[PDB]
Amino acid sequence: XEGXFTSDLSKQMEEEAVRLFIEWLKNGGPSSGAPP
């Protein structure tokens, strides 16, 4: 994570959170009963 502490950090991080949310949706996440 070297060179990570940028003003852009907080936004770069929200962007990855949104990406993961979309990945979760593609996996059926909100309604899935699958084991973790």
């Binding site: 936004k11 929200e14 949104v18 979309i22 949706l25 593609k26 059926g28 909100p30």
Partner: protein, 98 residues
């Protein structure tokens, strides 16, 4: 970019899907059943054909893929195409990718 904004747009998209699911008229006797798969809203499918729907409009990059569709295939048995080891039906969403 905002996670809360994307979740709210997704809730809105889900809500619009639930409106269609309940309100659209029934289809023939044989068709693949309309459904919300948490990513996209699917109508009833014609047996033996691919089914197209627009890339979901809650995607943050939806405006970069304005002509993208996502696909399922409805088999002649009236079942969505799905591998035995998959919990989700077959879907091609390559046109909606970031």
């Amino acid at each position: 970019v905002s996670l809360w904004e994307t979740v709210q747009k997704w809730r809105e998209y889900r809500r619009q899907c639930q409106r269609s699911l309940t309100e659209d008229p029934p289809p023939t006797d044989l068709f693949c059943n309309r459904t919300f798969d948490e990513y996209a809203c699917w109508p009833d499918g014609e047996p033996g054909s691919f089914v197209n729907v627009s890339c979901p409009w809650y995607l943050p990059w939806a405006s970069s893929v304005p002509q993208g569709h996502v696909y399922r295939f409805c088999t002649a048995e009236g079942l969505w195409l799905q591998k035995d080891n998959s919990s989700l039906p077959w879907r091609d969403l390559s046109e909606c990718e970031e």
